[PDB]
Write a protein that binds this ligand. Structure first.
Ligand SMILES: O=C1Nc2ccc(Cl)cc2[C@@](C#CC2CC2)(C(F)(F)F)O1
Lengths: 543, 403
């Protein structure tokens, strides 16, 4: 079955010439097969015989397809694939089940062999030349060249999709009520028609595909739901998490632990509650992938507690365009967020989790923002719209923060949902000096070379202190300076510094950092009642 | 309906842009597919296969003056790899004009065809929700709007079309920047608006703005009756920083007042010397620094700072501290809750002035996270062009200053 669609013009990479490879010496059997095989597609029109006017060649092989003692072939286009031009990206993006709509019935039509159905570019064919070996290398070489898309060739996938995309455009317009997801050599067709009516349309489309030479399996060979889709198992009315099985075992190797955390982490998305903290600790210092590790009981408790979470599978439902989208977010740990997108409460579409490492110096609100942003995007990619958000943050809070942050930020129409823990600002710097408050003139500096330093302060109330630091850097000095001022201060303080780093860091009301010291300061700040922080030029000899 | 097409090429060695399309909302996709089927009928653009490896991002916006959607392509990458070039001049006229009105003339281009061999370089793609399908691939056959090569090639045609109005109304300035046409006159609002409607018809037959009103805002120094240790501190901080623009500024006399571990709240009187040092400074800041001249051969830069409460500040310079112009901006009525809105409005206003004054888009340094901007800027854009931009972290100092 050969296709009548127009061929895609193909060209070799800028200034390169076709493959000039050899044709491995074969056994009487291997040659016997190929000859028969070729003669088969030869009559089919798949390949044709080419004269000596073709100086190209690609190595051909013969392998007995496992399960069948019958001979099968294979052509090595590696060389060709290198010399071939680039095409557009074949995978725009993965269709996520949560994006699928609910259908009464659906059937998948595996096309597969269709490759050999799509005609190759008339002019490019010559480069697809290959030769058959004579048992003892008598005299000639029974040459052929590909006359259609070749298995394993670079272009095949790319070009097949297109063709497939075209051969479907007409049908796509006619039966809008019908859905068809294109994906590799699979054709996913779902609808809301009554089963019989559906089977009909299937055949209709099926014949349509056949109208262009595309051979597909009939009803009696079509695969039926539920469908094994990347991690998910989906039925016409719902999708389900293909329950995860954790191999219970004696000894554990490093490698094993990795793969475990792999699986485990992937599941964190769906089963929030999964933990790997202890499990991850086992890697520390690992010398070999095949090294075995003594699973700590803490890791035992955790690993077990997981096997339970991964017990109760959880189903989910599909997208209903008529319904608006609702995304809700919860704060799990520090910089650990969970969200779910549902159209009807408890009836989830998707759920994920995010873990934003300490980064540098960030805060919860910012983070939240980053999540909303991330989620927003997923949404535009899956459903084309952005969900209304239900956020654990007081409108007053959000307002106070964004109107005063230096960077442009924003959250789409969202609504406060009183579901603790709520995100809040852990402190705020006074806008002006605190009247009747001690004033600390903190300074810090360290010898970049020796890493020796002093940090200290003096106040309007005559108090003072200084400290010499070993193995430090200038910036840790400036911060330390401030830490002291915060320690020895008391509920209310005015702190002037000449440090720009700090003024920066803190003024950005961060509530978490990579730097322990900052964390220290931060804690100290939350503790205070009122803190005013001022900056002044350094080496200007001020106060 | 073709004409003899001019041959265009990419700068030597360069290859076609291959830019990934950003996910688009449903609402936008529809607008596009609709907008493109018709353009395909009309033979403007044509579907293309996979054998075309290039791509340029595409999307849709809608100006206030129109509830209908408008397609926009991001040729920034393509424009950048396109050969330069018969010419396109820039006047200093409208820079002074009383009133200028911008006209979206993009349309004209679609009349002119595009050199076969180059067309491949305009392949763009319309995405499918949840990737149900490999997006749609098109490629222009005519001059694309927003491509630097279009106003050029359509140079001839344009000049002609205009000449009448030109020397017939010479008391008017006409500038063209890509898909836009800037018209400036000192003729009072009545005549200006009517003359404009007059010119429209002239073009249609074929197929508010106020310069000077924009004066670089001087850096003002606050006046107190009494000063607190903090007040002087804040002040000295600003001047110190400002000496970078005016080396004339001195701060020693005030720094003297700050000697001692005093309480920020403590009140302090000014020595007659500090009174002078200050007064003298005030004067210096009364005018923009000497020696700042627009160097056409260098990149123009725009820096913006969120001042909050709705305000934003920005500066255009080629060399740090040698601003060509600085300004402020108060959020448009309505963007009262969303920054991105404002920032995109702000960027656009500036890019415009830029064009008006130097006929060159500034490169923007934006106070926002990339992710944020990329996610929502398209929602508020209403300009045919797209300037270059980078994201940064506003050094609080450069902020208090312009405040
Ligand atoms: O939007 C829907 N609805 C749907 C509902 C249940 C199932 Cl099991 C499958 C689908 C479907 C798909 C698909 C694979 C490509 C992902 C189909 F296209 F209909 F086949 O996409």
């Amino acid at each position: 079955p050969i296709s009548p669609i127009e061929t895609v013009p193909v060209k070799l990479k800028p200034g390169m010439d076709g493959p000039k490879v050899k044709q491995w010496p074969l056994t009487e059997e291997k040659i016997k097969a190929l000859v028969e095989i070729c003669t088969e597609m030869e009559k089919e029109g798949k390949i044709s015989k080419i004269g000596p006017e073709n100086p190209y060649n690609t190595p051909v092989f013969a392998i007995k397809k496992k399960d069948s003692t019958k001979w099968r072939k294979l052509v090595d286009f590696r060389e060709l694939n290198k010399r071939t031009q680039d095409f557009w990206e074949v995978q725009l993006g993965i269709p996520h089940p949560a994006g699928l709509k609910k259908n009464k019935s659906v059937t998948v039509l595996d096309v597969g062999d269709a490759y050999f159905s799509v005609p190759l570019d008339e002019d490019f064919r010559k480069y697809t030349a290959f030769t058959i070996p004579s048992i003892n290398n008598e005299t000639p070489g029974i040459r052929y060249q590909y006359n259609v898309l070749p298995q394993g060739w670079k272009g095949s996938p790319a070009i097949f999709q297109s063709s497939m995309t075209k051969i479907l455009e007409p049908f796509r317009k006619q039966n809008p009520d019908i859905v068809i997801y294109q994906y590799m050599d699979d054709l996913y067709v779902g609808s809301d028609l009554e089963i019989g009516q559906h089977r009909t349309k299937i055949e209709e489309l099926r014949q349509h595909l056949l109208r262009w030479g595309l051979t597909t399996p009939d009803k009696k060979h079509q695969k039926e739901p539920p469908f094994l889709w990347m991690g998910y198992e989906l039925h016409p009315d719902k999708w389900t998490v293909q329950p995860i099985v954790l191999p219970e075992k004696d000894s554990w190797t490093v490698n094993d632990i990795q793969k475990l955390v792999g699986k485990l982490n992937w599941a964190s998305q769906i089963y929030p509650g999964i933990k790997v903290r202890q499990l991850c600790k086992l890697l520390r210092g690992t010398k070999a992938l095949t090294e075995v590790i003594p699973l700590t009981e803490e890791a035992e408790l955790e690993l077990a507690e997981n096997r339970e979470i991964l017990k109760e599978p959880v189903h989910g439902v599909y997208y209903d365009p008529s319904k608006d989208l609702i995304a809700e977010i919860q704060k799990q740990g520090q910089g650990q967020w969970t969200y779910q997108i549902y159209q009807e409460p408890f009836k989830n579409l998707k759920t994920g989790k995010y873990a934003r490492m300490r980064g540098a110096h960030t805060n919860d609100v910012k983070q939240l923002t980053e999540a909303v942003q991330k989620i927003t995007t997923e949404s535009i990619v899956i459903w084309g719209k952005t969900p209304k958000f239900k956020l654990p943050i007081q409108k007053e809070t959000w307002e106070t923060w964004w109107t005063e942050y230096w960077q442009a930020t924003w959250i789409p129409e969202w609504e406060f949902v009183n579901t603790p823990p709520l995100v809040k600002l852990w402190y705020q710097l006074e806008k002006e000096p605190i009247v009747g408050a001690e004033t600390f003139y903190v300074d810090g500096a360290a010898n970049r070379e020796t890493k020796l330093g002093k940090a200290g302060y003096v106040t309007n109330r005559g108090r003072q202190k200084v400290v010499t630091l070993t193995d430090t850097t200038n910036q840790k000095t400036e911060l330390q300076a401030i830490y002291l001022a915060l320690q020895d201060s008391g509920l209310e303080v005015n702190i002037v510094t000449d440090s720009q780093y700090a003024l920066g860091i803190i003024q950005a009301q961060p509530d978490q950092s990579e730097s322990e010291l900052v964390n220290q300061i931060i804690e100290q700040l939350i503790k205070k009642e009122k803190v005013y922080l001022a900056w002044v030029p350094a080496h200007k000899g001020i106060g």
